Amino acid sequence: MEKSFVITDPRLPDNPIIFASDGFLELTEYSREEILGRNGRFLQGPETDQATVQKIRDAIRDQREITVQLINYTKSGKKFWNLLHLQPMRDQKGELQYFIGVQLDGEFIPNPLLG
Ligand SMILES: Cc1cc2nc3c(=O)[nH]c(=O)nc-3n(C[C@H](O)[C@H](O)[C@H](O)COP(=O)(O)O)c2cc1C
Ligand SMILES: [Cl-]
Ligand SMILES: [Co+2]
Ligand SMILES: [Mg+2]
């Protein structure tokens, strides 16, 4: 599939998605109109590890890059493992401008060696 990514605007409330790639639409099964303006946490669900969610929270707060692997769900409820790479993007004035999150679908590291 084409690269799956979203870009969020941390200068707006709760870091909404302002761009979703065609690959993200394909991976998640959502349409662009179901995505724009919401927070990326919508892909989470019952099996998502909250310890991993906390790590993401801290990285966003600290404006630090992180990679985690966590369970996400398609629109039709199919579970997938998401190796999510989150990167802050700063402008030439040194100011945070965006986050980008790139999703790779797969259980890259076996679950027994995550937990
Ligand atoms: C650019 C960007 C992309 C994100 N992509 C995803 C994603 O693909 N899947 C996911 O579960 N969370 C994703 N998140 C994480 C959630 O948006 C959120 O930051 C996380 O769940 C921690 O915050 P919370 O505890 O308030 O939900 C993304 C965050 C950002 C900033
Ligand atoms: Cl966020
Ligand atoms: Co591909
Ligand atoms: Mg939550």
Author numbering: 1 to 115
Sentences from the paper on this structure:
miniSOG (for mini Singlet Oxygen Generator)1 is a 106 amino acid flavin-binding protein that generates 1O2 under exposure to blue light. It was originally developed by Shu and coworkers for correlative light and electron microscopy (CLEM) as it both fluoresces and catalyzes the photo-oxidation of diaminobenzidine (DAB), providing high-resolution images. Novel applications are being actively developed since. miniSOG was engineered from the LOV2 (Light, Oxygen and Voltage) domain of Arabidopsis thaliana phototropin 21. The absence of a structure of miniSOG so far had prevented to rationalize these observations, which we have attempted here using a combined structural and photophysical approach.
